[PDB]
Amino acid sequence: APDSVDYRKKGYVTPVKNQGQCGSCWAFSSVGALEGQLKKKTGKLLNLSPQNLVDCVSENDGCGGGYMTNAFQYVQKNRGIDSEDAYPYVGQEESCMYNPTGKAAKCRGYREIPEGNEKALKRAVARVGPVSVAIDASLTSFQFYSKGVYYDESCNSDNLNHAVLAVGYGIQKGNKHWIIKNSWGENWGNKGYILMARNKNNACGIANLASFPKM
Ligand SMILES: *C(=O)([C][N]C(=O)[C]([C][C]([C])[C])[N]C(=O)O[C]C1=[C][C]=[C][C]=[C]1)[C][N]C(=O)[C]([C][C]([C])[C])[N]C(=O)O[C]C1=[C][C]=[C][C]=[C]1
Structure with a gap:
């Protein structure tokens, strides 16, 4: 059988969102992994709130930046992250407004991947599902990409x-x-x-x- 896995065709992934002028790509990524696991456990996909992370993970910079691990640690220590309808994305920083009732997910920690380990990463995406990664996107060839397998020395x-x-x-x-x-x-x-x-x-x-994230 093909050595491949594509979670899109399994209901593990939500519609593509636009981050706007806010540097919250780390919030979207974090939330993306949270949605994948949600589907794994509860069997139903729901859209989580990236804004909830932007305004509440004080360990991060908001639209200035942040690490996914910090956002994970937040959903575990605060025990709950709202859904999009419960805490909409306003495209900018604002006062944390976590509405406990709108909680749609929980997590019990998080696991990293050996720095520089593609074999292990393959195993993670294969075993766990959608993993949050960070890459170098400062490159024009990357930005105007349209199709194919991207590679630039x-x-x-x-x-x-x-x-x-x-x-x-x-x-x-x-x-x-x-x-x-x-x-x-x-x-x-x-x-x-x-x-x-x-x-x-x-x-x-x-x-x-x-x-x-571990769920
Ligand atoms: C992300 O949002 C970062 N933003 C982007 O990569 C870009 C910015 C652009 C200059 C390429 N996107 C953007 O600004 O959106 C605008 C747009 C919308 C729609 C269409 C076109 C354009 C948030 N990421 C971070 O803050 C990261 C977190 C992780 C990568 C770590 N911070 C960061 O990379 O800097 C700190 C750092 C230090 C050491 C090691 C790693 C990271």
């Missing part, structure tokens, strides 16, 4: 600036690839997604800041 594994979410992997045609869910509306890349090279020596440092 200048993607810097040391400059992780954009958080994203791995929804699977595969071989489009000869080339191994990580199926990525970006957060720049669905007008970007291939309807919101982008296939990135897999096994071509830790391309873009996709496996350097990976993690997954």
